[PDB]
């Protein structure tokens, strides 16, 4: 076989940091290394490749490189951008062994999440109400800097989603947001992000 | 006119129709390393311990074949349909050791200017038909796109026995070669 | 571009059988392979089938696969003994030494009981006036609840025109009950405007959940509806508070 | 185990007849400055071709007009690579631990069973052994201690 193993199962870096993914492959005959990209349960997108003649390639922000001797190869995303955030797979194939010319062996994945730069954060925990039933209720924690990360419910009738970025686009402004909900009699709102560890300045309204 | 200290043939693929007839072989300084048996899809080492350590994945040969096959159809209809200048062969015979009446030796027919590569090369003992202790090569390659070839005979070199090589080609009808010097 | 797979979403009453077909849409990319992505992401090669009538079987943990290149431009996979889920991607390629171009894939989730299946319920959460008065903006929230299995796509609409600014949905559906191994699921998304936008009543905002569920012709006998494929949605117009 | 690798035969989309394909890797000192030709041959006419020194799929004849575009626009980068991916790989990883570090010593003067070719007319016997004809006896060969004579 080829085992092609992606050292590194996750990366967080925020905008303009160089994200670097590292792989190794075993079989000395491999000579064609493509890299692929998967966002948010969609399909894989071919990104860049490189061959074993050359020791480095470079195109646009990306650059990939290869120490044949080492049997190590890396992809460098450069000047990162929220849109880059995906699971990146490296892969190999010996372009001149007839047993597998036609196939790719793939690394496990590396999840790259590239975080905004919010420099104008107005952290805040607003609350909201339903149409069909005016009494149903859900809380929203917006506008925090993207160093603040939400924390998982551990009560199993409270539901707290994960931090997720929203780009508008019309203006030039990206804002983070988790939501929390539950129905249970107490639940209520200035508490819902309580496991979760939040600014000091975090603004709270009077419902 | 192309020189340099060594040469490798890590291709060599020929295929021909009608009858659709293939070989895949690798040479290094004009000596066959292996040939792929396309029927039992496997690699066949010219000298058994030649692939002791070393591997060859036969499916490369098989692919190259099926390229050539396809590449034929599409160059058949583009030469209008031109067929092949049959050229007539050119046997020669000599032996392995110098001759030692009592102990084994091996007798070899060298057929040059073959093309297209189909041929019989058979062995004759006093003009009786010899089928045992015979090894042929795959069609080796000549710079001009002929081929050459090589049949081998193991024997007990008893004078009086006399030895004949018969070469039933197409461009020629047979041609025997009694030995010489 | 390049490839069309069919279907995208399917249940596999276990072990039992089902199949799918990938269609080439351009012959500069003639080599067509099959890949599986298992349940923890991670691609495995299955087959590459060059010439029509070329056809093979691979037995793999945990499915069994009959793949067959039927024409110059169709490729087929039959999959059965299907143990736990996976997603199947068709590929195509100009050649040996050359990148694969991946299809749009087919998700295959196992089903131990018809009964397990439920569509979402949805509603929309009309923003806080405090969000209005502090930020200047006004964020809505869809909430997709109570759906099994996790086969959905969630679309936002500003007056029958699918929208994509200032949105975010959750990558992963939440398990309503993490311990049970066939929980029903949940999902949230945000759509943020500017306060003024929300503060014109002319607009209608809705967001809908395509729940690819079970087949029209499925063998059902219950007092719930039939838990069959569908849309579901809910709605909310603008307001000067 | 080391693996011998192969130059890849390129397709083209669209009374006996022959196709041929040669995969020529030539070496100087090995290693340093190396060359590669891949001939695509009809009957005896070499119609198409790729030289490592042209880095592009030429034609030689009038029958490589509607080939040599399609070979650059499908096989070009992979093929250029073949010089290192295959020629080089094979030289270093395979020929050196076999077909260079095996030699075999010889046995109106004629000499048998010798390998490699250099010695001091010539017959190739094609079974990885050699013979030659020249008109005490001294045959000097690079496989040896005491250049065998009689
Ligand atoms: C070799 O012998 C066979 C036996 O049928 C014969 O048909 C064939 O024509 C001979 N080969 C050639 C090249 O003449």
Give the CATH number, domain containing residue A57: 2.60.40.10
Q: Does any CB of chain A come closer than 8 Å to the CB of residue D25? A: no
B27, D78, D80: which is closest to A94 by C-alpha?
A: D78
Residues A84 and A164 in one domain: no
R_g of chain A computed on alpha carbons: 22
Query: In the numeric block, which tokens belong to residue C152?
Result: 């959905």
Determined by X-ray
Task: Give nearest CA residue, ligand 1 atom 8.
Answer: B120
Atom of ligand 1 nearest to the CA of B169: 13
For chain C, give the DSSP string.
--EE-S-SEEEEESS-EEEEEEEE--TTS-B-EEEEE-TTS-EEEEEE--STT-EEEEEETTEEEEEEEEETTEEEEEEES--S-EEEEEEEBS-TTS--EE---EEEEEES-GGG-B--B--BEEPPHHHHHHHSEEEEEEEEEEEBSS-EEEEEEESSSB--SSEEE-SSPEESSTTSTT--EEEEEEEEEEHHHHT-TT-EEEEEEEE--B-TT-----SS---BSEEEEEEEE----
Instruction: Name D39's bridge partners.
Output: D22, D49
- 3-state class (DSSP) for residue B30: coil
Residues A82 and A181 in one domain: no
Give the C-alpha separation, A166 to D81, whole Å: 44
Query: How would you write chain D as a 3-class SS string?
Result: CCEECCCCCCCCCCCCEEEEEEEEEEECCCCCCEEEEEEEEECCEEEEEEECCCCEEEECCCCCCCCHHHHHHHHHHHHHHHHHHHHHHHHHHHHCCCCCCCCECCCCEEEEEEECCCCCCCEECCCCCEEEEECCCECCCCCCCCCCEC
Residues C94 and C2 in one domain: yes
Could you give the residue ranges of the DSSP H alpha helices within chain B? 59-76
Positions of E strands within chain A: 4-7, 10-14, 19-25, 32-38, 44-51, 56-59, 62-67, 72-77, 86-92, 105-106, 111-115, 124-130, 137-142, 159-160, 166-168, 173-175, 177-181
Residues 6+ apart with CB under 8 A from C7: C20, C106
Residues C157 and C106 in one domain: no
Contact predicate A180/A97, CB 8 Å:
no
Residues C32 and C151 in one domain: no
Instruction: Name A201's bridge partners.
Output: none
C174, A187, B8, C11: which is closest to D92 by C-alpha?
A: B8
Task: Give nearest CA residue, ligand 1 atom 1.
Answer: B120
Atom of ligand 1 nearest to the CA of B168: 14
Query: Which residues in chain C touch residue D70, judged by CB atoms under 8 angstroms apart?
Result: none
Q: Which CATH number fits domain B4-83: 3.40.50.2300, 1.10.530.10, 1.10.357.10, 3.10.320.10?
A: 3.10.320.10
CATH architecture of B84-181: Sandwich (2.60)
How long a stretch of residues is chain D?
A: 150
Contact predicate C143/C111, CB 8 Å:
no
Residues C119 and C88 in one domain: no
Query: In the numeric block, which tokens belong to residue B106?
Result: 């091996």
* End residue of a domain, out of C83, C112, C141: C112
Q: Measure the N-to-C terminal CA separation of chain D; round to a whole number of Å.
A: 43
Q: Specify burial of residue C224 (Cβ count, 10 A radius: 0-12, 13-18, 19+).
A: exposed
Give the C-alpha separation, B37 to C125, whole Å: 71
How long a stretch of residues is chain C?
A: 241
Instruction: Name B111's bridge partners.
Output: B149
Query: In the numeric block, which tokens belong to residue D103?
Result: 């030699």
Q: Does any CB of chain A come closer than 8 Å to the CB of residue D34? A: no
Q: How far is the CA of D37 from the centre of ligand 1 (A)?
A: 35
- Identify the helix (H) or strand (E) that includes residue B36: strand B32-37
- 3-state class (DSSP) for residue B76: helix
Phi, psi of C46, deg, nearest 5: -110, -65
Query: In the numeric block, which tokens belong to residue C211?
Result: 């729940």
Give the C-alpha separation, A148 to A196, whole Å: 9
Task: Decide if C235 and A131 are in contact by the 8 Å CB cutoff.
Answer: yes
For C77-90, give the DSSP string.
EEEES--S-EEEEE
Task: Give nearest CA residue, ligand 1 atom 3.
Answer: B120
Residues C134 and C235 in one domain: yes
Residues A13 and A94 in one domain: yes
Residues C99 and C24 in one domain: yes
Domain extent for A37: 1-116
Phi, psi of C114, deg, nearest 5: -40, -40
Choose the mutation target among D74, D79, D85, D86 for the interface with C, i.e. most C CBs under 10 Å. D74
C-alpha separations of C168 from A71, A189, D7, D149 in Å: 40, 22, 49, 89
Residues A84 and A46 in one domain: yes
* End residue of a domain, out of A65, A87, A116: A116
Task: Decide if C97 and A102 are in contact by the 8 Å CB cutoff.
Answer: no
Q: Does any CB of chain D come closer than 8 Å to the CB of residue A31? A: yes
Give the C-alpha separation, A76 to A20, whole Å: 5
* End residue of a domain, out of C112, C133, C149: C112
Query: Which residues in chain C touch residue A144, judged by CB atoms under 8 angstroms apart?
Result: none
Contact predicate B29/B7, CB 8 Å:
yes
* End residue of a domain, out of A93, A116, A139: A116
Residues C194 and C103 in one domain: no
Phi, psi of C181, deg, nearest 5: -90, 20
Query: Which residues in chain D touch residue A51, judged by CB atoms under 8 angstroms apart?
Result: 77-78, 81, 85
A153, A164, A156, A145: which is closest to A195 by C-alpha?
A: A153
- 3-state class (DSSP) for residue B62: helix
Residues C206 and C162 in one domain: yes
Residues C125 and C50 in one domain: no
Residues 6+ apart with CB under 8 A from C1: C25, C26
Residues A6 and A93 in one domain: yes
Contact predicate B46/B34, CB 8 Å:
yes
* End residue of a domain, out of A89, A116, A143: A116
Residues C188 and C168 in one domain: yes
CB atoms within 10 A of CB B92: 14
- 3-state class (DSSP) for residue A123: coil
C133, C114, C103, C81: which is closest to C36 by C-alpha?
A: C103
Query: In the numeric block, which tokens belong to residue B159?
Result: 């004078």
Q: How far is the CA of A69 from the centre of ligand 1 (A)?
A: 52
Residue in chain B closest to D44 (alpha carbons) equals B145
The half-sphere exposure of A21 on its side-chain side, counting CA atoms within 13 A, is 30
* End residue of a domain, out of C112, C135, C169: C112
Say how many domains are in chain A. Answer: 2
C-alpha separations of A171 from A87, A143, A166, C136, C155 in Å: 28, 15, 12, 13, 22
Query: In the numeric block, which tokens belong to residue B59?
Result: 């499916």
Residues A196 and A101 in one domain: no
Query: In the numeric block, which tokens belong to residue C51?
Result: 């010439």
Contact predicate D43/B84, CB 8 Å:
yes
Give the C-alpha separation, A187 to A157, whole Å: 9
C49, C99, C98, C51: which is closest to C77 by C-alpha?
A: C49
Q: Specify burial of residue B174 (Cβ count, 10 A radius: 0-12, 13-18, 19+).
A: exposed
Chain B residues 19-38 within an 8 A CB cutoff of chain A: none
Residue in chain C closest to A127 (alpha carbons) equals C128
Task: Give nearest CA residue, ligand 1 atom 10.
Answer: B120
Residues C192 and C217 in one domain: yes
Residues C83 and C131 in one domain: no
Tell me if B166 CB under 6 Å of ligand 1: no
Query: In the numeric block, which tokens belong to residue B158?
Result: 């008893």
CA D109 to chain CA centroid, Å, is 31
How long a stretch of residues is chain A?
A: 207
Residues 6+ apart with CB under 8 A from B77: none
CB atoms within 10 A of CB A26: 13
Return the sign of the alpha-carbon dihedral for residues C149, C150, C151, C154: positive
Alpha-carbon dihedral C128, C130, C132, C136, rounded to 10 degrees = -140
| CATH number of the structural domain spanning residue C47 | 2.60.40.10
What contacts 24+ positions apart, CB below 8 Å, involve B163-166?
Answer: B163/B93, B163/B107, B163/B123, B163/B124, B163/B125, B164/B123, B164/B124, B164/B125, B164/B126, B164/B127, B165/B91, B165/B93, B165/B109, B165/B121, B165/B122, B165/B123, B165/B124, B166/B120, B166/B121, B166/B122, B166/B123, B166/B124
Give the C-alpha separation, B50 to B28, whole Å: 13
Tell me if B168 CB under 6 Å of ligand 1: yes
Report which DSSP code applies to A84: G
Q: Where in chain B is the domain with CATH 3.10.320.10?
A: 4-83
Tell me if B170 CB under 6 Å of ligand 1: yes
Give the C-alpha separation, B140 to B123, whole Å: 20
The pairing of beta strand B105-114 with beta strand A173-175: unpaired
Domain extent for C183: 113-241
Contact predicate D7/D81, CB 8 Å:
no
Q: How far is the CA of B120 from the centre of ligand 1 (A)?
A: 7
Query: In the numeric block, which tokens belong to residue A141?
Result: 């924690």
A197, A203, A190: which is closest to A123 by C-alpha?
A: A203
């Amino acid at each position: 076989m080829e085992k092609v193993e992606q050292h590194e199962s996750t990366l967080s870096v925020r905008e303009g940091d160089s994200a670097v993914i590292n792989c190794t492959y075993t079989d000395t005959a491999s000579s064609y290394f493509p890299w692929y990209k998967q966002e948010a349960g969609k399909g894989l997108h071919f990104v860049i490749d490189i061959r074993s003649n050359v020791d480095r390639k470079q195109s646009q922000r990306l650059i990939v490189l290869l120490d044949k001797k080492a049997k190590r190869f890396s992809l460098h995303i450069t000047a990162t951008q929220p849109e880059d955030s995906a699971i990146y797979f490296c892969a190999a194939s010996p372009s001149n062994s007839g047993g597998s010319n036609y196939k790719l062996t793939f690394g496990k994945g590396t999840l790259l999440t590239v975080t905004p730069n919010i420099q104008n954060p107005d952290p805040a925990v607003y609350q909201l109400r339903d149409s069909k039933s005016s009494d149903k209720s859900v809380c929203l924690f917006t506008d925090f800097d993207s160093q603040t990360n939400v924390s998982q419910s551990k009560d199993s009738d409270v539901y707290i989603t994960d931090k997720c970025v929203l780009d508008m686009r019309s203006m030039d402004f990206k804002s983070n947001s988790a939501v929390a909900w539950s129905n249970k009699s107490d639940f209520a709102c200035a508490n819902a992000f309580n496991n979760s560890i939040i600014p000091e300045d975090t603004f709270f309204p009077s419902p | 006119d192309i020189e340099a200290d060594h040469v490798g043939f890590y291709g060599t693929t020929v295929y021909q129709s009608p009858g659709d007839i293939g070989q895949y072989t690798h040479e290094f300084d004009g000596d066959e390393l292996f040939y792929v048996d396309l029927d039992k899809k496997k690699t066949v080492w010219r000298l058994p311990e030649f692939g002791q350590l070393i591997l060859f994945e036969p499916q490369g040969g098989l692919q190259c074949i099926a390229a050539e096959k396809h590449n034929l159809g599409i160059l058949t209809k583009r030469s209008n349909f031109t067929p092949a200048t049959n050229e007539a062969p050119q046997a020669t015979v000599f032996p392995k050791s110098p001759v030692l009446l009592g102990q084994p030796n091996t007798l070899i027919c060298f057929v040059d200017n073959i093309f297209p590569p189909v041929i019989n090369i058979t062995w004759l003992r006093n003009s009786k038909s010899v089928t045992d202790g015979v090894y042929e090569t795959s069609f080796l390659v000549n710079r001009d796109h002929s081929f050459h070839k090589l049949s081998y005979l193991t024997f007990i070199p008893s004078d009086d026995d006399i030895y004949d090589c018969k070469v039933e080609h197409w461009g020629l009808e047979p041609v025997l070669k009694h030995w010489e010097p | 571009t390049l490839l069309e797979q069919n279907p995208r979403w399917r249940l596999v009453p276990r072990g039992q059988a089902v199949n799918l077909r990938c269609i080439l849409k351009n012959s500069q990319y003639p080599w067509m392979s099959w890949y599986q992505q298992d349940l923890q992401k991670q691609l495995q090669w299955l087959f590459t089938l060059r010439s029509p009538g070329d056809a093979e079987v691979k037995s793999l943990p945990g499915a069994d696969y009959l793949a067959t290149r039927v024409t110059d431009t169709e490729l087929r996979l039959q999959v059965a003994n299907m143990s736990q889920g996976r997603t199947l991607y068709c590929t195509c390629s100009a050649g040996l030494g050359y990148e694969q171009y991946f299809g749009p894939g087919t998700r295959l989730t196992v089903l131990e009981d018809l009964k397990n299946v439920f569509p979402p319920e949805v509603a929309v959460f009309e923003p806080s006036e405090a969000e209005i008065s502090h930020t200047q903006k006004a964020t809505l929230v869809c909430l997709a609840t109570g759906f099994y299995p996790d086969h959905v796509e969630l679309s936002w609409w500003v007056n029958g025109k699918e929208v994509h600014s200032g949105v975010c949905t959750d990558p992963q559906p939440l398990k309503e009950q993490p311990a049970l191994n066939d929980s029903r699921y949940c999902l949230s998304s945000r759509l943020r405007v500017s306060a003024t936008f929300w503060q014109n009543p002319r607009n209608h905002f809705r967001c809908q959940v395509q729940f690819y569920g079970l087949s029209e012709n499925d063998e059902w006998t219950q007092d719930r509806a039939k838990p069959v494929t569908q849309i579901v949605s809910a709605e909310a117009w603008g307001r000067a508070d | 185990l080391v693996e011998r690798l192969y130059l890849v035969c390129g397709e083209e989309g669209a009374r006996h007849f022959v196709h041929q394909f040669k995969g020529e890797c030539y070496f100087t000192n090995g290693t340093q400055r190396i060359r590669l030709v891949t001939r695509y041959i009809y009957n005896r006419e070499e119609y198409l071709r790729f030289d490592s020194d042209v880095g592009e799929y030429r034609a030689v004849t009038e029958l490589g007009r509607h080939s040599a575009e399609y070979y650059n626009k499908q096989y070009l980068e992979r093929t250029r690579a073949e010089l290192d991916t295959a020629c080089r790989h094979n030289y270093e990883e395979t020929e050196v631990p076999t077909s260079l570090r095996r030699l075999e010593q010889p046995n109106v003067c004629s000499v048998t069973d010798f390998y490699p070719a250099k010695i001091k007319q010539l017959i190739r016997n094609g079974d990885w052994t050699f013979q030659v004809l020249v008109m005490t006896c001294h045959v000097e060969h690079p496989s040896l201690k005491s250049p065998i004579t009689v």
